[PDB]
């Protein structure tokens, strides 16, 4: 099916830029049609980020179609257009702006300070404790699907930009584990699908979010993993790998409490185990470079801002059911 | 070093078009500059493909810089410009042009015929090495070119992985990449294993290697194009002929004086599992009934063979000349 292909999604977006983008993605699009789309998308992002709420929603939805549709025929042009948007977004976000590199120590300290200081979101705590209702746990898991199901593709984009063969090898090991090792039935998306199904939810591999904060989270994560300055991607990769085994263990026990079997909750179990590291040298190697430090730190801050708004919205939805 | 970065490479190319390409790679390149570069590149490629031998050499040199340079900052714009060239190349290349899909039996027969016509095992380069006829110097020639084929093959496979939207299919390419990059130990990646072999015969294994052989450049440009193509039939064809369908070289190296450890690169690829038995074959088998897939696949295979033959011929001529 084609529900998450670019053209069906654009046909369903009742705004002027939808046809402009569709024309730019057509097989015989001209350079003028592509440039017009890029200009207009950049202008739209700028208005949104300046406070035009309709322009914000429109550019976010368009970026979601551009960056995350599954019709590979249009992927190169879609990513070309996404960059016109990313260039604007990156001008608006608070930048680390270091004139000189932090010491390996002040750098590692800044990371600890960001992390620890501001995972005990009141929602996580509610779920960890075993207090969530069926409907509330279903809300949580529907959103877990969106975060998990195509994470491996974002990691693959970083793999492509790691020119050093040993560094590519590290990402290839990550991907191999994430996709089930020798058995694709055990890929992490498929593990999570088994869990959703155990609690009466469908796990749609063509899922398209309608939650603004989830869209912004997925859009930011794809941007970060695809960025030509791999500091952006390494920041998201780092924080995900560091925090997952801990959250996933508490989620595992909460799910058992909820009446899921050990086999049904396997998704959360496997992360306690496989993720606790070798990938750290990718970061440690680059720490002396201030430009890597600026990208990494800026990316980390931006990730936290979008993640916080996303978790807040999930908590709100859970509270409303 | 920046020997395989785009701008240093363009500086070494006396071609007028090289100046306009370099300008399109600037941080603040305008749409006008990038579009002008794309038009000039497409016109150069077209002239070359219509028999202007200088234009042909020039566009291949430019494509090699665009598609295979290692400065990631310029990669997105470089690949955008490479596609302007690719569209021209695909327009001029001989194509399968099936109106109706072949049955799987007839598709298989055509593959068998194409492979038999290519007769890779009887190429003079191959026979010369298999027969123990190569001196140390001729062996070095052979291995310097093996390096170019091997050292970044995993990256072309990664491009295909990115274009496989089905999670099960991506999983298959991830298994391939894992094996190619040494599984749990990066010291055992296949490029590193080949590096060990080059060193054992007194050659440097340069991860920033830049070819000066026109036929090698054509071969690498084509392989990258095929594996990056949005129609995965193109990349599946090259994956098939490379990985689905070394022992003879392994034997020849041992009989020449190399140890099993030095020649490990060729041992790890020895297999007797038929192509249809490999799990990756299902990527192809699933798509066979689609005529658009067959056309991409058979076009890609035919083109790959033509560039591979010209390249092996060129290596053979170099080996005879040393
Ligand atoms: Ni996982
Ligand atoms: Ni290999």
Residues 6+ apart with CB under 8 A from B118: B305, B308, B309
What resolution in angstrom units was achieved for this structure?
1.9
Interface test with A, best of B181, B184, B185, B280 (most A CBs within 10 A): B181
Question: Would the annotation count A90 as a binding residue?
Answer: no
Owner of token pair 């990349």: B235
Residue B254 CB-density burial (10 A; 0-12 exposed, 13-18 middle, 19+ buried): middle
Contact B192 A73 (CB under 8 A): no
Phi, psi at B210, each rounded to 5°: -130, 115
Of B31, B154, B170, the CB nearest to A179: B170
Owner of token pair 């997925």: A218
Minimal Cα–Cα distance from B134 to chain A, Å? 31
* Pairwise CA distance, residues A228 & A158, whole Å: 9
Q: Do B32 and B75 meet the contact criterion of CB atoms below 8 Å apart?
A: no
Q: Do A206 and A4 meet the contact criterion of CB atoms below 8 Å apart?
A: yes
Angle A309-A114-A291 from CA coordinates, rounded to 5°: 100
For residue A163, what are its two tokens? Answer: 């020119």
Q: Do A293 and A96 meet the contact criterion of CB atoms below 8 Å apart?
A: yes
Nearest alpha carbon to residue A277 among A233, A307, A239, A248: A239
A5-92: which CATH number, 3.50.50.60, 3.40.50.300, 1.10.1240.20, 3.40.50.460?
1.10.1240.20
Cα A232 from chain centroid (whole Å): 12
3-class DSSP assignment, residue B174: helix
**Phi-psi label, residue B299: left if phi above 0, alpha if psi -120 to 50, beta otherwise:** alpha
For residue A27, what are its two tokens? Answer: 């097989």
Contact A182 B189 (CB under 8 A): no
For the annotated binding site of B, the residues are: 180, 190, 269
Cα A116 from chain centroid (whole Å): 21
How many Cβ atoms are within 10 Å of A318's Cβ, its own excluded?
Answer: 20
Q: How many CB pairs under 8 A join A and B?
A: 102
A102-321: which CATH number, 1.20.910.10, 3.40.50.300, 3.40.50.970, 1.10.10.10?
1.20.910.10
For residue B212, what are its two tokens? Answer: 């000066």
Per-residue CA distances from B61 to A7, B14, B116, B144, B147 (Å): 36, 11, 32, 19, 19
Nearest ligand, CA B192: 2
Nearest alpha carbon to residue A203 among A189, A221, A220: A189
Nearest alpha carbon to residue A65 among A222, A193, A226, A227: A222
Of B154, B175, B231, the CB nearest to A176: B175
Nearest alpha carbon to residue A168 among A155, A180, A177: A155
User: For residues B301, B307, B308 and B310, what is the CA-based torsion angle, rounded to 10 degrees?
Assistant: 140
Nearest alpha carbon to residue A21 among A68, A78, A76: A78
Segment (H or E) for B192 = helix B190-200
Nearest alpha carbon to residue B161 among A240, A226, A152, A183: A152
Angle A26-A10-A189 from CA coordinates, rounded to 5°: 100
Angle A201-A203-A209 from CA coordinates, rounded to 5°: 100
* Residues of chain A contacting B167 with CB distance shorter than 8 Å: 152, 179, 184, 187, 189-190, 205
Experimental method, per PDB record: X-ray
Per-residue CA distances from A33 to B240, B258, B302 (Å): 37, 59, 34
Handedness of CA B200, B204, B208, B214 (dihedral sign): negative
CB contact, 8 Å: A210 with chain B?
Answer: no
Question: Would the annotation count A248 as a binding residue?
Answer: no
CB contact, 8 Å: B128 with chain A?
Answer: no
* Pairwise CA distance, residues A132 & A138, whole Å: 9
Number of helices and strands in chain A (H, E): 16, 0
User: For residues A37, A39, A40 and A43, what is the CA-based torsion angle, rounded to 10 degrees?
Assistant: 150
Q: Where along chain A do its domains lie?
A: 5-92, 102-321
For residue B225, what are its two tokens? Answer: 């194009």
* Pairwise CA distance, residues B7 & B22, whole Å: 6
- Provide long-range contacts, Cβ within 8 A and 24+ apart, for A86-90: A86/A223, A86/A227, A87/A42, A88/A42, A88/A45, A88/A46, A88/A49, A89/A45, A89/A49, A89/A223
Segment (H or E) for B218 = helix B214-228
Segment (H or E) for A275 = none
Name the CATH superfamily for B102-322.
Heme oxygenase-like (1.20.910.10)
Residues 6+ apart with CB under 8 A from B43: none
Q: What is the DSSP string of B41-102?
A: HHHHHHHHHTT-HHHHHHHHHHHHHHHH---GGGHHHHHHHHHHHHHHHHHHS-----SSPP
CB contact, 8 Å: A105 with chain B?
Answer: no
Radius of gyration of chain A (CA): 20
Nearest ligand, CA A271: 1
Nearest alpha carbon to residue B275 among B266, B285, B267: B285
Domain pair A5-92 / A102-321, same fold? no
Minimal Cα–Cα distance from A9 to chain B, Å? 17
* Pairwise CA distance, residues B32 & A194, whole Å: 51
Residues 6+ apart with CB under 8 A from A43: none
Q: Do A153 and B164 meet the contact criterion of CB atoms below 8 Å apart?
A: no
Residue of B nearest to A178 (CA): B171
For residue B194, what are its two tokens? Answer: 């080949």
Residue of B nearest to A38 (CA): B31
For the annotated binding site of B for Fe(3+), the residues are: 180, 190, 269
Interface test with B, best of A163, A233, A282, A291 (most B CBs within 10 A): A163
* Pairwise CA distance, residues A113 & B228, whole Å: 41
**CA distance from start to end of chain B:** 29
3-class DSSP assignment, residue A245: helix
* Pairwise CA distance, residues A258 & B189, whole Å: 44
């Amino acid at each position: 099916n084609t529900r998450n292909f670019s053209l069906p999604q654009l046909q369903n977006l009742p705004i002027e830029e939808a046809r402009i983008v569709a024309d730019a993605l057509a097989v015989h699009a001209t350079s003028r049609q592509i440039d017009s789309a890029a200009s207009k998308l950049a202008a739209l992002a700028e208005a949104g980020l300046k406070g035009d709420r309709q322009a914000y929603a429109a550019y976010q939805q368009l970026l979601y179609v551009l960056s995350l549709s599954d019709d590979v025929a249009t992927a190169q042009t879609r990513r070309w257009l996404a960059r016109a948007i990313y260039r604007v977004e990156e001008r608006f976000m608070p930048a680390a702006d270091l004139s000189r590199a932090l010491s390996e120590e002040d750098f590692q300290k800044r990371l600890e300070q960001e992390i620890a200081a501001q995972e005990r979101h009141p929602m996580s705590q509610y779920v960890f404790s075993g207090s969530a209702s069926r409907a509330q746990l279903q809300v949580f898991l529907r959103h877990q699907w969106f975060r998990t199901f195509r994470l491996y593709r974002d990691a693959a984009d970083l793999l492509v930009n790691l020119t050093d063969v040993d560094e590519a090898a590290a990402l290839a090991r990550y991907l191999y584990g994430e996709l089930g090792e020798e058995d694709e039935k055990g890929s992490h998306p498929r593990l999570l699908a088994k869990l959703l199904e155990a609690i009466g939810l469908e796990a749609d591999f063509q899922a398209v979010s309608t939650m603004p904060e989830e869209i912004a989270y997925l859009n930011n994560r794809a941007r970060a993993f695809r960025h030509a300055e791999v500091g952006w991607g390494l920041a998201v990769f780092y924080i995900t790998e560091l925090v997952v085994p801990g959250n996933h263990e508490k989620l595992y026990r909460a799910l058992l409490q909820a009446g899921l079997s050990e086999d049904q909750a396997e998704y959360y179990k496997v992360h306690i185990s496989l993720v606790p590291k070798r990938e750290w040298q990718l970061i440690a190697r680059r720490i002396p470079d201030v430009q890597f430090q600026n990208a990494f730190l800026t990316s980390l801050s931006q990730h936290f801002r979008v993640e916080r708004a996303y978790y807040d919205a999930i908590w709100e939805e859970m509270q409303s059911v």
